[PDB]
Ligand binder design. Structure first.
Ligand SMILES: *[C@@H]1O[C@H](CO)[C@@H](O[C@@H]2O[C@H](CO)[C@@H](O)[C@H](O)[C@H]2NC(C)=O)[C@H](O)[C@H]1NC(C)=O
Ligand SMILES: *[C@@H]1O[C@H](CO)[C@@H](O[C@@H]2O[C@H](CO)[C@@H](O)[C@H](O)[C@H]2NC(C)=O)[C@H](O)[C@H]1NC(C)=O
Ligand SMILES: *[C@@H]1O[C@H](CO)[C@@H](O[C@@H]2O[C@H](CO)[C@@H](O)[C@H](O)[C@H]2NC(C)=O)[C@H](O)[C@H]1NC(C)=O
Ligand SMILES: *[C@@H]1O[C@H](CO)[C@@H](O[C@@H]2O[C@H](CO)[C@@H](O)[C@H](O)[C@H]2NC(C)=O)[C@H](O)[C@H]1NC(C)=O
Ligand SMILES: *[C@@H]1O[C@H](CO)[C@@H](O[C@@H]2O[C@H](CO)[C@@H](O)[C@H](O)[C@H]2NC(C)=O)[C@H](O)[C@H]1NC(C)=O
Ligand SMILES: *[C@@H]1O[C@H](CO)[C@@H](O[C@@H]2O[C@H](CO)[C@@H](O)[C@H](O)[C@H]2NC(C)=O)[C@H](O)[C@H]1NC(C)=O
Ligand SMILES: *[C@@H]1O[C@H](CO)[C@@H](O)[C@H](O)[C@H]1NC(C)=O
Ligand SMILES: *[C@@H]1O[C@H](CO)[C@@H](O)[C@H](O)[C@H]1NC(C)=O
Ligand SMILES: *[C@@H]1O[C@H](CO)[C@@H](O)[C@H](O)[C@H]1NC(C)=O
Ligand SMILES: *[C@@H]1O[C@H](CO)[C@@H](O)[C@H](O)[C@H]1NC(C)=O
Ligand SMILES: *[C@@H]1O[C@H](CO)[C@@H](O)[C@H](O)[C@H]1NC(C)=O
Ligand SMILES: *[C@@H]1O[C@H](CO)[C@@H](O)[C@H](O)[C@H]1NC(C)=O
Ligand SMILES: *[C@@H]1O[C@H](CO)[C@@H](O)[C@H](O)[C@H]1NC(C)=O
Ligand SMILES: *[C@@H]1O[C@H](CO)[C@@H](O)[C@H](O)[C@H]1NC(C)=O
Ligand SMILES: *[C@@H]1O[C@H](CO)[C@@H](O)[C@H](O)[C@H]1NC(C)=O
Ligand SMILES: *[C@@H]1O[C@H](CO)[C@@H](O)[C@H](O)[C@H]1NC(C)=O
Ligand SMILES: *[C@@H]1O[C@H](CO)[C@@H](O)[C@H](O)[C@H]1NC(C)=O
Lengths: 955, 219, 49
């Protein structure tokens, strides 16, 4: 029998108190929704694997399950008999089926209930976590979440590969296995883990872990990277059966004098270096090139053995960077020498002995004698062999006894070619290497192709397929269904849709196009639709239409509406200020003295942040302080039917308008990070917007150009209408309609802003980027950067200065670098905000103070006027535009013939209703009788193309 | 007719900071993690850059709500737009667009993401804008696309520069001929002068150099 | 820099192509009548009349 473990098997990973936080940790936990074995005690004590650790749970009525046995052969015995818990690590004799009734290295003595345990063995410590809770369930494990606490930690040094349970005989239990998975643990206000995300359960969990949140907003996120794994390895070396004569170098009867050292060449052989390294006959074995235990894996184009006799005190001179009587005059090594220096005492071989004599790298320049005597250590003879390794990636001839394999092509493999390794697919090559070229290289100096060590053929190496992995999801408030895109790959190694962006799995391919929702790329978008599921489709670019074009047809608006649109622009960012010394070296004299060695690196960051903070007040003033005086509206709000009560300040409140309050209600330490206040507070900004609104409403644009001069609102609108090419009589004749459309448009603004949180996303995004930047900077304080601790006080309290300073320098570099990264990002972000503020300031002058003639600059339509509203970190513009609503098809002509003269409109166009010709304004159908006061004459009927016959009335 | 060339977007590059620094290496990756968010915040910065490239493209080209097309009868009062309108025999790009496209041009964790809007989708946006501009003047911008005879549209354009519209009509044949010749000159310049599109090629070159520098540093 | 260029290009699309410009040297070196957009790799090309 088996069951579903659901969300069980989580525990507090350490002994640190945390609260109100999502913490990411990697440890041995039971995988969520894992398969666990279900055991019974009815009418069952098998030996089970321990693997990397065991999750255990049981349900009890009569406390039948009392203990466990852990070990190999089956030894750690844990038994809870009555009230006395007994833990022993003793050579106890066990039965083939041990049970309870109803030489030692360690010893300790102390359904209705669910008991959970975690058993893991790390570095000799057997760690036990547990939790007890009441239940009311017989059938199976209860579904729910709880984290287990550490209870016991046994310092045993015991090898556990298997375990067995213990039952009392006259109670079901479950066994699962732990894996090194990362979990996001949710700690509530009281520091209790209440939830968790298994970061390797599915793509939604991956998204939740990546974003460090239990809620995922609608969109596409890159959470991981796909990589094709190798299936098998390939080991290739030349098929050489001769072994290298190292014995003939080290076991030689005689060695040469140091002034005239011997050089033996080793090639075309199998080099077993385990003999030289493991041998205890050597007094020293120092490698400068490679570690002595890697010598049988890597291999050389050649090896040279330099053999000679020196004094014991001269051993220290045979090394790169050394000078002296031997190093300079007898035997010099390159300072970039690659190889091993091996030496041993030869006092019982050479000493009597004056046959040994002494006087550029590897120079043999062919004079004093040594007096080697058996009773001399520093003056005793030593035999030294220097093994010079040419480990350049050339054809290898001297390789160790590494077992070879065959060659596998057109598959992802883990390869080793003469000591050079990597992962990739081996394919046929059309490249030709020169006789002396074993390896090829790319621009990154990675291997491009190789010559097979045994076969004289060229193989191309194409690293195994990989790409980013993105999770496409609706918000988790609607659905937990996800689709996954594997970027820039084929639907091979990975309801599948192949797109140019990669392989999309889980989204249905739909023939119908829709406006783009969640973009994928290359014309493809996805959405959650119909019951509902994720679909993918080619995005629509808009509805298809066609203009009814002809040489004699014009469509002229017969009706219009006044609409109000909202444009939201950032003006300023949070005026953050970071104390670079407190951040890096918080209240630490030792660290501060080291920080000062970096000169101005710290203080110029304080300066850069100060500059950013200062320009935030400049940005705010440029946008809002465009009026010299503070204007107020009259006590009698008579604006010809236009209702501004939602944009003007509310006297009962900070004097913000009703709409401003809606805007403000939607948009939202001790580490040297502080925030400075703005010069202009919300109340002061409200007074500036009030002045601008009062100016705009009662004096039109005159307060902008100069003095604020009163004008009746209806007349102000008359100017605004002429400014868009619409005769002012249209305004007055339809004034009630226009005022009503305006008032309704504002009501629509209210309904949208109060219900759609995303309505102010442009300002919330600024807040979110700044919050993320600050959180990143603080989080970096917890990083070690190679140090023994990320906590400065823990370094100082543990190490003396000669060692502490090194660990501190590691933190200073990381933290100083973190501030530099932060500041650079703040400076670039500040440039974006400044540019936005400049745009907002331009709009304030051209949209609010004046009237714009720039298309789409002050709303999507013909601009009449605008009203500013303040918002957190920015300005919101309500743009009032004139938009054609209804149109009719009229017959037209460029000119009309009277007596042969060509008559053209002074303004407007000629139109025909099917029987009569009229002249009318371009933006509003209003047919007038064609008279000499409406048209002018230039040229004649034999010149104008498309001219038609009519009559022109002469008063 | 003069030509002004402006960059709208840059290559949507994406670099896997772990693969770049510690390519398929467990020992290196474990050391890289000691730097905390230094690696992943770079992945984030590059993602942000790539995303705003689609925003930039949409802001420039997707200014029309509907996709408009020209009529089967190309009667624009003598004005010849056949070199700026989409070619039905081809991706529906214009003759001049093909000339523009014919002049302007790994395993280290460095990959390139596709744009949301492909060359064909951009061509459909420019087609809609051209059709709007030619058959409805500026009305498709302010609101609904309302037909107007091209000669009358030009009359509005002339009044807009302080020139009485009778000048247009009396010289309509001359104006249309100068316009058509001006386009022919655009063709001759773009097809023969590689430097004509240097402003976009420079963007390509800077991005190529940036990517090549990053890869070269691996050595 | 690219974003700023795109912002300029977008402004020009609205003021040069969708409308008619009254801004000197903004939409060609002369009195602006109209413009026609053309696409190009990584950008937009404006033919200013
Ligand atoms: C301007 O609009 C406001 C609504 O935003 C009007 O206020 C409402 O008036 C009606 C009629 O007296 C009341 O029943 C509502 O309860 C009021 N609403 C609020 C929120 O106060 C205001 O009367 C309008 N002013 C003019 C002159 O028309
Ligand atoms: C122009 O359009 C407006 C609406 O935008 C029309 O006004 C509406 O007329 C209907 C009756 O047909 C009323 O029920 C609505 O309450 C009116 N709306 C407003 C805001 O007053 C107007 O009649 C149309 N004019 C013409 C000439 O067609
Ligand atoms: C075009 O407009 C004219 C002028 O309004 C229309 O002629 C008038 O029609 C009304 C009846 O609706 C008569 O009472 C007037 O006496 C007519 N005036 C003249 C000068 O004839 C004409 O019918 C309209 N044509 C179309 C096709 O709608
Ligand atoms: C506008 O009306 C005039 C007459 O006032 C038309 O002139 C006639 O043109 C035809 C064709 O060339 C000649 O055969 C007639 O003899 C002309 N009439 C006179 C009285 O000389 C003119 O063609 C009309 N134009 C349009 C566009 O209808
Ligand atoms: C619009 O301009 C194009 C050229 O760009 C004209 O196409 C040419 O027409 C002539 C005459 O029939 C042919 O000999 C050429 O071979 C055509 N060239 C190409 C490239 O097709 C087109 O006819 C003009 N249209 C109008 C209405 O004038
Ligand atoms: C205004 O300038 C245009 C040219 O830009 C003149 O049109 C040209 O006239 C010559 C004859 O003098 C012809 O050979 C050309 O083919 C014409 N060009 C075009 C495009 O048609 C026009 O005649 C001049 N007008 C005045 C009043 O001087
Ligand atoms: C566990 O695996 C076995 C064997 O494949 C299967 O029969 C059983 O249904 C699985 N149980 C669960 C809970 O997945
Ligand atoms: C529990 O078992 C231990 C032996 O492991 C024994 O010494 C102890 O007396 C037992 N306790 C009870 C209450 O029987
Ligand atoms: C106890 O361990 C020692 C290890 O040297 C072994 O020789 C001895 O026989 C063991 N005794 C028992 C009872 O297992
Ligand atoms: C914290 O404990 C108190 C009781 O002291 C309890 O009332 C409160 O609900 C707990 N908070 C949470 C988040 O469980
Ligand atoms: C080589 O010989 C010249 C004399 O001809 C001498 O000056 C030079 O130092 C010698 N080089 C070495 C490395 O001894
Ligand atoms: C490997 O063995 C083959 C014979 O099977 C031989 O021809 C080839 O030369 C050998 N390669 C090397 C590098 O010795
Ligand atoms: C999101 O979920 C919560 C909890 O069910 C619900 O109260 C809220 O209205 C939901 N919001 C939306 C926009 O669906
Ligand atoms: C995927 O591989 C198949 C061959 O099995 C090929 O026909 C297809 O074009 C490839 N698709 C992509 C996107 O590479
Ligand atoms: C789209 O329709 C065609 C038939 O015209 C069909 O062959 C194709 O499979 C359909 N594709 C999808 C995604 O529905
Ligand atoms: C003009 O006529 C065409 C063709 O019947 C029609 O599609 C278009 O909608 C009409 N326009 C107006 C404003 O009536
Ligand atoms: C307008 O177009 C129609 C249909 O092609 C044509 O018969 C008529 O002559 C044209 N008018 C002018 C002035 O070119």
């Amino acid at each position: 029998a088996y069951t579903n473990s659901f969300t069980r098997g989580v525990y507090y990973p350490d002994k640190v108190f945390r609260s109100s936080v999502l913490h990411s940790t990697q440890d041995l936990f039971l995988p969520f929704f894992s398969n666990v074995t279900w055991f019974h005690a009815i009418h069952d004590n098998p030996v089970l694997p321990f693997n990397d650790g065991v999750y255990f749970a049981s349900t009890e009525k009569s406390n039948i399950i009392r203990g466990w046995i852990f070990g190999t052969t089956l030894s750690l015995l844990i038994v809870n008999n009555a009230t006395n818990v007994v833990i022993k690590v003793c050579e106890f004799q066990f039965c083939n089926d041990p049970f309870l009734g109803v030489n030692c290295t360690f010893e300790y003595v102390s359904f209705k209930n669910l008991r959970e345990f975690v058993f893991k063995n790390i570095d000799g410590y057997f760690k036990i976590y547990s939790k007890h809770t009441p239940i009311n369930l017989v059938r199976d494990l209860p579904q729910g979440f709880s984290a287990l606490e550490p209870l016991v930690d046994l310092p045993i040094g015991i090898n556990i590969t298997r375990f067995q349970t213990l039952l009392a005989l006259h109670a079901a239990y479950y066994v699962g296995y732990l894996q090194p998975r990362t979990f996001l643990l949710k700690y509530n206000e009281n520091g209790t883990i209440t939830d968790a995300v298994d970061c390797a359960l599915d793509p939604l969990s991956e998204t939740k872990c990546t974003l460090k949140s239990f809620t995922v907003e609608k969109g596409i996120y890159q959470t991981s990277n796909f990589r094709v794994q190798p299936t098998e390895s390939i080991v290739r070396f030349p098929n050489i059966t001769n072994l290298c004569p190292f014995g003939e170098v080290f076991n030689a009867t005689r060695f040469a004098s140091v002034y005239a050292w011997n050089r033996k060449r080793i090639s075309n052989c199998v080099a077993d270096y385990s003999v030289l390294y493991n041998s205890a006959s050597f007094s020293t074995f120092k490698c400068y090139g490679v570690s002595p235990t890697k010598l049988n894996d890597l291999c050389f184009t050649n090896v040279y053995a330099d053999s000679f006799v020196i004094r014991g005190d001269e051993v220290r001179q045979i090394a790169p960077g050394q000078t002296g009587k031997i190093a300079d005059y007898n035997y010099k090594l390159p300072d970039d020498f690659t190889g091993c220096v091996i030496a041993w005492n030869s006092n019982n071989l050479d000493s009597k002995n004056y046959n040994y004599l002494y006087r550029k790298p590897f120079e043999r320049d062919i004079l004093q004698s040594y007096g080697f005597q058996p009773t001399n250590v520093g003056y005793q003879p030593y035999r030294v062999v220097v093994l010079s390794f040419e480990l350049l990636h050339a054809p290898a001839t001297v390789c160790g006894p590494k077992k070879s394999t065959n060659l596998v092509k057109n598959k992802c493999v883990n390869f080793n070619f003469n000591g050079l390794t990597g992962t990739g697919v081996l394919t046929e090559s059309n490249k030709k290497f020169l006789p002396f070229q074993q390896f090829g290289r790319d621009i990154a100096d990675t291997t491009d192709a190789v010559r097979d060590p045994q076969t004289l053929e060229i193989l191309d190496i194409t690293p195994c397929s990989f790409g980013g992995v993105s999770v496409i999801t609706p918000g988790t408030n609607t659905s937990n269904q996800v689709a996954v895109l594997y970027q820039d790959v084929n639907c091979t190694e990975v309801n599948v849709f192949q797109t140019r962006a990669g392989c999309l799995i889980g989204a249905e391919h739909v023939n119908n196009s829709y406006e783009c929702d969640i973009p994928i790329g290359a014309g493809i978008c996805a959405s959650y639709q119909t019951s509902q599921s994720i679909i993918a489709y080619t995005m629509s670019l808009g509805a298809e239409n066609s203009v009814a074009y002809s040489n004699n047809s014009i469509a002229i608006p017969t009706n219009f509406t006044i609409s109000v649109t909202t444009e939201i622009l950032p003006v300023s960012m949070t005026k953050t200020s970071v104390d670079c010394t407190m951040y890096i070296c918080g209240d630490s004299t030792e660290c501060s003295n080291l920080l000062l060695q970096y000169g101005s690196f710290c203080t110029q960051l304080n300066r850069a942040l100060t500059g950013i903070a200062v320009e935030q007040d400049k940005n705010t003033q440029e946008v809002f302080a465009q009026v010299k005086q503070i204007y107020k509206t009259p006590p009698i709000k008579d604006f010809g039917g236009f209702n501004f009560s939602q944009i003007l300040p509310d006297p009962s409140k900070s004097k913000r308008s009703f709409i401003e309050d809606l805007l403000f209600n939607k948009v939202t330490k001790f580490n040297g990070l502080t925030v400075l206040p703005p010069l202009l507070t919300d109340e002061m900004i409200a007074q500036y917007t009030s002045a601008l609104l009062a100016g705009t409403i009662t004096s039109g644009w005159t307060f902008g150009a100069g003095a604020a001069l009163q004008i009746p609102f209806a007349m102000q609108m008359a100017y605004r209408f002429n400014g868009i090419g619409v005769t002012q009589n249209v305004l007055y004749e339809n004034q009630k309609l226009i005022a009503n459309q305006f008032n309704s448009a504002i009501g629509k603004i209210q309904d949208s802003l109060s219900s759609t949180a995303s309505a102010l996303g442009k300002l919330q995004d600024v807040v979110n980027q700044n919050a993320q930047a600050l959180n990143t900077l603080v989080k970096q304080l917890s990083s070690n950067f190679g140090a023994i601790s990320s906590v400065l006080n823990d370094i100082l309290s543990r190490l003396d200065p000669p060692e502490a300073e090194v660990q501190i320098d590691r933190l200073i570099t990381g933290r100083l670098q973190s501030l530099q990264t932060y500041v650079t990002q703040q400076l670039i972000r500040a440039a974006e905000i400044r540019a936005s503020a400049n745009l907002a300031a331009t709009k304030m002058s051209e949209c609010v103070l004046g009237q714009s003639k720039r298309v789409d600059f002050c709303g999507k339509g013909y601009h009449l006027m605008s009203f500013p509203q303040s918002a957190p970190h920015g300005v919101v513009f309500l743009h009032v535009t004139y938009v054609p609503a209804q149109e009719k098809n009229f017959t037209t002509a460029p000119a009309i013939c009277h007596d042969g003269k060509a008559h053209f409109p002074r303004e407007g166009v000629f139109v025909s209703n099917g029987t009569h010709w009229f002249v009318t304004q371009r933006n509003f159908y209003e047919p007038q009788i064609i008279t000499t006061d409406n048209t002018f004459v230039s040229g004649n009927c034999d010149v104008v193309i498309g001219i038609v016959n009519n009559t022109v009335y002469d008063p």
